[PDB]
Amino acid sequence: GDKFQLTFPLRTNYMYAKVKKSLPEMYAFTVCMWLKSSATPGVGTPFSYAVPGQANELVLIEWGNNPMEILINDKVAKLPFVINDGKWHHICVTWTTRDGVWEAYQDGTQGGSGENLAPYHPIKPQGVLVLGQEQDTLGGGFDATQAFVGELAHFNIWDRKLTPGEVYNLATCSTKALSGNVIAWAESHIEIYGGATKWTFEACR
Numbered sequence: 507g508d509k510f511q512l513t514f515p516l517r518t519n520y521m522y523a524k525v526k527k528s529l530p531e532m533y534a535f536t537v538c539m540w541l542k543s544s545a546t547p548g549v550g551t552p553f554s555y556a557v558p559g560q561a562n563e564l565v566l567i568e569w570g571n572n573p574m575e576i577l578i579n580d581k582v583a584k585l586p587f588v589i590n591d592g593k594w595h596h597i598c599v600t601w602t603t604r605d606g607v608w609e610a611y612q613d614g615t616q617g618g619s620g621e622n623l624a625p626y627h628p629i630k631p632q633g634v635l636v637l638g639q640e641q642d643t644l645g646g647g648f649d650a651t652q653a654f655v656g657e658l659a660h661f662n663i664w665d666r667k668l669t670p671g672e673v674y675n676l677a678t679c680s681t682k683a684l685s686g687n688v689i690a691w692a693e694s695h696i697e698i699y700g701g702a703t704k705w706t707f708e709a710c711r
């Protein structure tokens with residue numbers, strides 16, 4: 507049952523979701539989600555992933571008056587996304603250990619790409635995946651100024667790069683659209699905390 511969204515209505519250090527499943531060691535991956543936010547200057551942290559010894563193992567964050575960034579092993583790449591206009595947007599980032607090459611997609615359109623992002627470092631396994639907060643400890647250490655304020659749906663992770671056509675299918679809600687083979691969006695796949703609330707969501711409607 508994937509037809510739902512999570513709403514994070516206020517800036518707090520206590521509202522979050524925990525994904526029940528952890529991540530394997532990933533030499534490449536794609537992360538995608540639908541999100542909506544009117545928060546400014548920055549939307550905060552839609553998701554973060556911490557492992558022992560590195561709480562910033564995989565992070566998506568737009569913090570204050572700074573641009574939206576992906577962090578891998580606490581190394582930054584600035585992303586092209588502009589998504590805090592109060593309308594729904596779909597985003598994906600694909601990345602590979604091979605020369606640290608990444609691509610960024612907004613609303614089904616590839617709109618940025620770069621290299622030398624945490625090259626040669628597979629994503630480390632067995633950490634804690636949180637939605638709506640940035641981690642400074644394993645599964646915690648939240649900071650309200652970094653918290654996501656807005657709505658999130660259809661959070662998915664695959665341990666490969668999706669093709670541009672596969673991303674297009676996600677962003678247009680095609681019947682061909684895939685679910686994540688590592689993390690897939692379902693109510694029973696997450697735990698919610700602190701005031702985050704679940705509502706029905708009909709994507710592309």
Ligand SMILES: C[As](C)(=O)[O-]
Binds near residue numbers: 641652
């Ligand atoms: C300095 As930080 C992004 O780990 O709160």
Ligand SMILES: [Ca+2]
Binds near residue numbers: 640641642643
């Ligand atoms: Ca952190």
Ligand SMILES: [Ca+2]
Binds near residue numbers: 640641647649652
């Ligand atoms: Ca922090």
